[PDB]
Amino acid sequence: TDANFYVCPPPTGATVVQFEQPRRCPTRPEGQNYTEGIAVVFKENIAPYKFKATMYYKDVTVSQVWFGHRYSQFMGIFEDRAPVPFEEVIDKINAKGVCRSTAKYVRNNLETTAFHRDDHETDMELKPANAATRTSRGWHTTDLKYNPSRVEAFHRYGTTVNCIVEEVDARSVYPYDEFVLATGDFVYMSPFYGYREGSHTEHTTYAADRFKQVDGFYARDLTAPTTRNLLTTPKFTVAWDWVPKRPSVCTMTKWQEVDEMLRSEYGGSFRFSSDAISTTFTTNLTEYPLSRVDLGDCIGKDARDAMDRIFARRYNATHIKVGQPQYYQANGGFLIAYQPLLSNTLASVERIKTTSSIEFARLQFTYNHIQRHVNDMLGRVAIAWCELQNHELTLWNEARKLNPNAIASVTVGRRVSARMLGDVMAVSTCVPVAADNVIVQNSMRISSRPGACYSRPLVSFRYEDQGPLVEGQLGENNELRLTRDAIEPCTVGHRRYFTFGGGYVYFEEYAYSHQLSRADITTVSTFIDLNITMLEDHEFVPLEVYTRHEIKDSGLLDYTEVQRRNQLHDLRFADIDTVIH
Amino acid sequence: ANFYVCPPPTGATVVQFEQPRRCPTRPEGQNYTEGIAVVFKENIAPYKFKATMYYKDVTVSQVWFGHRYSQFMGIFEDRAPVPFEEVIDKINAKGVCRSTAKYVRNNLETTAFHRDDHETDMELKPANAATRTSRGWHTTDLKYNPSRVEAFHRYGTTVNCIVEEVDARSVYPYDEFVLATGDFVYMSPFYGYREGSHTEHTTYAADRFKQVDGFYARDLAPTTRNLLTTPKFTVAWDWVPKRPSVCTMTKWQEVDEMLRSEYGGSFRFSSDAISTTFTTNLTEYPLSRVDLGDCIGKDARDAMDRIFARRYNATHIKVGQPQYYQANGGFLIAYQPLLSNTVERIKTTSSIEFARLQFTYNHIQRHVNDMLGRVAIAWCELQNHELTLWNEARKLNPNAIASVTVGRRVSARMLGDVMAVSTCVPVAADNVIVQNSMRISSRPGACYSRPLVSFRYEDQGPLVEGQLGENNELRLTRDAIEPCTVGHRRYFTFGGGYVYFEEYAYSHQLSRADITTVSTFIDLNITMLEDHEFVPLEVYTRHEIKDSGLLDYTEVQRRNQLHDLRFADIDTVIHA
Amino acid sequence: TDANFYVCPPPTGATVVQFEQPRRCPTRPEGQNYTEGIAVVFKENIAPYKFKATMYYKDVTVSQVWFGHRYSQFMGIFEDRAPVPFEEVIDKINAKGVCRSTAKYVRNNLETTAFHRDDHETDMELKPANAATRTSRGWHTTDLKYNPSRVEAFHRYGTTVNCIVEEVDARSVYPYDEFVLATGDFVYMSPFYGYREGSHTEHTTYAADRFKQVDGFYATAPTTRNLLTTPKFTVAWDWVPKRPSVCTMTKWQEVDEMLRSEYGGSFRFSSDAISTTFTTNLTEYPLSRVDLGDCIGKDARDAMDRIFARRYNATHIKVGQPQYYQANGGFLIAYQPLLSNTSVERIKTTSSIEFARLQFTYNHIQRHVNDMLGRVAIAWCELQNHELTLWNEARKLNPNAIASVTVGRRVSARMLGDVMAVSTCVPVAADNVIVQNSMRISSRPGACYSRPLVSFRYEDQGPLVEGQLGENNELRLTRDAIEPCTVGHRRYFTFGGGYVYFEEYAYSHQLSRADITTVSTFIDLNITMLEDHEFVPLEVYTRHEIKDSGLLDYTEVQRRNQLHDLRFADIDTVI
Ligand code: NA
Ligand code: NA
Ligand code: NA
Ligand code: NA
Known about the structure:
- The structure is a homotrimer.
- In chain A, helix 3 (about 360-400) runs antiparallel to helix 4 (about 405-410).
- Chain A starts with a strand and ends in an 8-residue tail after the last helix.
- Helix content of chain A is about 15%, strand content about 35%.
- Chain A contains seven helices and 36 strands.
- Chain A has five domains: about 1-10 and about 430-520, SH3 type barrels (Roll); about 10-35 and about 355-430, Single alpha-helices involved in coiled-coils or other helix-helix interfaces; about 35-45 and about 250-355, PH-domain like; about 50-245, no CATH class; about 525-580, Helix non-globular (Single alpha-helices involved in coiled-coils or other helix-helix interfaces).
- The radius of gyration of chain A is 51 Å and the shape is elongated.
- By secondary structure, chain A is α+β, with helices and mostly antiparallel strands.
- In chain A, the strands form nine sheets. In chain A, strands 4, 5, 10, 11, 12, 13, 14, 15, 16 and 17 form a ten-stranded antiparallel sheet that branches. A six-stranded mixed sheet of chain A has the order 26-1-31-30-29-27, with no helix packed on it.
- Chains in contact: A-B, A-C, B-C.
- At the A-C interface, strand 4, strand 5, strand 8, strand 12 and helix 3 of A face strand 2, strand 4, strand 5, helix 4 and helix 5 of C.
- The complex binds sodium ion (NA) (4 copies).
- One sodium ion sits at the interface of chains A and C.
């Protein structure tokens, strides 16, 4: 507060001031132009190529047992796998569901032959292997090992030959120059190797005579032809149905189908936002040439497929497709297939690498969303504020006429004296006067002229604590008027409260009564409340559902662990340096 | 900087001020319930238990002794299982094992004697030390090779009884398991005889399994010891019931303060502590529906009580018995309401991010809506409040107030409690002249309070007399008069500046820029939140994680299987 | 609307009121102080130590072949790998690039010897292994397998010895007490084991004689060549000191502009470029307390300097020495402050950086909204204080209206100096109020009332009282508002819910407020709420896709391969 008093000499043209005129208020931004569309999002494909294959091989075993007195002991059990020749796969196994009891094949640069039970060759029926949970189908000919008849004090050999046929899952990873079987065996030939148109261009690490391709092939299940591939390796023969590389594999995978994908141009790039998955992708304005995608023949297909299925299910009756689907590369390695729409209301080759984290895009979407909202609303507050200030000037132009000192003091920033000199305002500073130098007189009446009373209290004061006593009249807000003119006709029931210092001086019947604190008068406010509080600090702690360790441990068997342990066997349970001689 | 003439308004057009609008009200406010919660996630950890392996390393070498040397012609190596009886009576009961092996290998009952000597029981001594390895025990430590007999082939046998303690792991549905050695055991770790245990899975003949009640583990309390003898070994592990041993769910987070609220037919569980907000249907999730999840009810209470005591026992009270809800993302929430005293498997996502974004978004949303709502309300109140001032201001200067409210220069005058307005006519600045004297030539001591003017509506029109009003208004009636006074100084708005007069005599025009300006405006400087781009960011990429493994099985196999193609001939056949 | 009339008795000092004086407005917070700086963020290293090694071994094979009359059959094929002796590697392989056609080594506690083709030992020239995609380099001496010469009705043995030398990649994980080769072969010796200064302290599970270290070795700069001979092979690799060689941390992010600030007794490192804010204590982290983390200080400086040069050398100056802090989540931060010219342990890092991006995002928005709304609150307080001055003049002009608005109910008011005396007005039913037809004063020609006359009763049965219409439906008890009768008299007086129109000082008719054009004194503001939004779970790759990304699954291959006998053979049957 300022319970300090003031004297305000009449202002002279010395200083003149004018009110600032209306400011040009801001205008609301044009507004973003969004394009309704359907989108299909693709990601780098990390899944291997999977296809069915059949294995044809024979387990060949030759035991050596020495029959001692009362017992017999294995001296050695030689085991090996032999590939079933093409001819035999075609004419025996596939044609008749049978297999020879002999195994003739090349091993260690030598053609070796093995007869089951060691006797004359005979065709054998393939029978279902023994059931087993979570396993493919298998078939074999024999089920018992063949050991030599006993002959004491002698070493004898026995040959076993179990013809085995197994259907197995096959897998291949880019660039598909080789593949693996579910048994752990690698095949160093492309799953797409063949003779038909350019196929022979694919990779193969085997001599020509090891591979065979049979057209219009029919398989027998122990109804359409297939081009059947047949590769015979040193340990087995493997077959699979040949299909062309390009309409089969893809370096991308469909990831998200988005009904409502808004697109907008902004600072040289497109923003693709999906309210449904709370994501915003960013791309250049120029489409990405789909043909540049190394083996991505599934994208166009998949997008069209999904795209039409969505159009029908949701826009066929309210919008129209605007042009051909477009393709864009988003930051993070996401390929977006986009189909613009519009409501009727109007009427070198390379591989894309994708990030495993979509968080940046969700943060982008979230941030953009809040940002847009706060800039929009606070922007409106600003415009409304400016407008209100401009509007207010009109009221101040009228107030300044009724009370120039008060309006000027508020506007100038300090207690001043003022008066209108036309359309401008002349002002002069007022001089402070210590409260202890001001005396309020007991009477407001004028004996001089009966019936006439002063309208406000009379006073006596001095500018300096030692200075002379000057008489005047009390004005508003502690102003000391040098003239005692404020008068009126004495009235009955005279009651008044005048601002005096930090409280009021009360008069009744034109006589001083007493002073008081503002606390004795009830207060009413002209102010409109507004309780704004700050958004408080918040801390985000690291948080994971599963740690890399839990994940590493989610696997039943750990190859590294198993190898580490198993290879310590000798250092643990055996001597390695002792040379017995 | 345009002049206007405003004719007296006629009842022609009458306007009124809009009255106070109904101001918005603050929304009710969300009701939150305090509570304790435990969050479960899909269990991806393998069932783990200890087991012992009993088997013998059977080796039989063949050596051909040359004159100046000796050379191996072959080295048969096999693994023979140790018979039940021998583990029971010899290993478990004595800590010894036979120096011979007899088992079924390739549909034949083979038999081997260590050193090829008579059967002897042998001392099982601890295996040689090795870092990060379980405990092991064996009998022999050397390989027996036939004594030299130049020019002949000879076969020598070896038998090293080995017992190993090893970790066992099994994954749902637990119908089989594996050992630290990589050996699979196709029998449920919970297979047995005791109540329904025989129901479990097994792929062996009844006579390969054996259960020993009240067994007493030897060490080179009772347990219902299980023993399986496989073609290459025998393994034993303590039998325990299935249900109280495994769980398809895992405790993930313990939450002291988990607020719950209901909106739009869903429950929102948010944790300030971990900045997460889960969402669920209002209906609880039948904990009984959880395939093998008896650990849930357990862990939950355990934790909820520990927390209750540690933090709310002295200030709040539990309400009802714990509830269970299925949240989006596959998280199971055990919830325990509080109050101030005052059959299938659940699949869980590996990313909690959606729920934290949810929490973050919700928290900010709540705040801006709350505050901007208060601003909207206060703005409406202020506008209504101001009307009272406009009502007084209009009686004082109708033209000005009406012009601001109407939006264009108009004329106005009150007609009771309503305002009559009429449009004003613009006048080119060049068609306006200010006369030099404000004094009245026919009445002594009487002066015009405001400057007189001579103008013409049209550039060719007659010259009209009148006096300058405020804000460039041209008054047709020169009735603004006052007693002439001494020291007369005045500045009148004229065009885009002021016309200065002294002692009722024109002096000169000035620019507003020549006069000091003071503002009646309260400033406010709002700036926009600027654009921000978030780039892709990962601590470890999936490639780094793949490389984190010491050995890669695919890589190893890929390379090893190329051996013959790289260092040998796979096609050439020799005949002679 | 109100729809109710009021009689307002003259106020008596009974109740007096004053306006609240200006409130002290809030002040703008000081404002956060940010230190510009360069940073380098490190994470726990999950990558194994990698180094090159060379393998020396020999494929030894002894086949047993029985020569039938028309055919031939392998009776058994013994295959083994033999380590190449130190001496041979040195003097034969490394020296002349050849190898012995013989394999002498220890197997199963016995020293066996093998002669290729079962012939006299001869030095053989090593040759490049057959070409193969994505494979290291290898060399061998023989291409074919040797088999016994044909001899009908006889068992025969043939020996093949193929000397093989392969350059392979080696890998080792902390504590580095052992390592593996690309072949899957484990080597239980520290890649750092040796003789030179404390090396012998490193781990090793082999007898001293198996190991050999050759200083000043060749193969164009000498090296300390290690050579370990295991039961199945001999491996060599250039020795290097452990300390500088391996690291338990990995440089992760190089940040040009990393702002640092402190609050609540903690440091905040925020990067606008990667949208991340790290949190740490005010106390540096002893870099030396980092187990084997010798790469940190080096990499930090290399990076730090490169960046300073490229971006701040011409406008900023380094301040102090590089400082190091540990951030929540297990991130080690190397920080270099700038200014314009104007026991021991291993850090464990989280896999998810999201908490830190959320932190940054939230702080950025929080900072912005608190700033602007805070400015709104200040401007609002100032405006409320500012307008009191207008209210001070208004109250003088229309005390009843200004007081009614400030008091919150219809009251009567008058100034008693600088305070306001007020009294409550009494309501009157609209049906108890009658507007006279004339505003003319018969008993005083030329004199007319400026506002309509009325009659009314406080109660539906009470006497009828005379008076005149005031503003906003006030019923004044004194018919004193008079004026000079004039021409073309036109007036609209608020009456009930609308107006009463008077012409030529004569009642004409009443009308709805709808008959008059409405203009507004209100400034509009259209604020709308930010709407609810649901974030659904979303992953690029599920953990199952990741699991499946591996070409061969060991668990799957083992599970299946061990079911061979159970599927294609009888395990329980003795004959
Ligand atoms: Na003005
Ligand atoms: Na306020
Ligand atoms: Na009004
Ligand atoms: Na006041």
